[PDB]
Amino acid sequence: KNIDGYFKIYSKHTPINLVRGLPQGFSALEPLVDLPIGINITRFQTLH
Amino acid sequence: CYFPLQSYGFQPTYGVGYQPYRVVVLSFELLHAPATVCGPKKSTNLVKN
């Protein structure tokens, strides 16, 4: 999430028995690190 | 036609006034970017009750 240029990174990692792609349940994410950068981002990619 | 760069003679025997001084110039500029660098803080004692 980008708030006034400050980047807020939220992360959650749990082991799961899910079949394909999604489980059924409720989980709340936790904060990880905040990045005071301020760059505008209009697009993104994934890395493999 | 002259070569612009000239050399500084450096020996301990030169006079004090002409001795080379290492100069560190700090440029202080306040832009519209969010402020980060600040002066040092001070922590005091903690009291309860």
Side-chain angles (χ1 to χ4, degrees):
Chain A
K1 180 177 74 180
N2 188 341
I3 302 301
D4 291 344
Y6 296 140
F7 296 159
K8 294 177 179 177
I9 293 171
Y10 299 138
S11 63
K12 180 62 174 172
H13 182 197
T14 300
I16 189 64
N17 290 283
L18 62 80
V19 176
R20 181 178 181 171
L22 182 66
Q24 186 173 356
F26 178 80
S27 179
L29 276 68
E30 294 178 351
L32 178 62
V33 63
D34 290 344
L35 297 175
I37 297 170
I39 186 169
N40 291 283
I41 297 168
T42 59
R43 288 175 295 180
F44 61 91
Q45 294 178 336
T46 325
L47 302 174
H48 284 270
Chain B
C1 299
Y2 298 138
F3 180 77
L5 296 175
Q6 295 300 321
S7 296
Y8 292 97
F10 287 159
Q11 292 179 336
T13 60
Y14 292 98
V16 177
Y18 295 139
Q19 292 176 336
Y21 297 143
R22 293 181 181 175
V23 177
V24 176
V25 175
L26 276 67
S27 178
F28 296 159
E29 294 177 351
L30 177 63
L31 296 175
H32 60 284
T36 59
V37 175
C38 298
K41 271 68 180 180
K42 183 173 178 290
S43 63
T44 60
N45 291 337
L46 177 63
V47 64
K48 296 176 180 178
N49 291 337

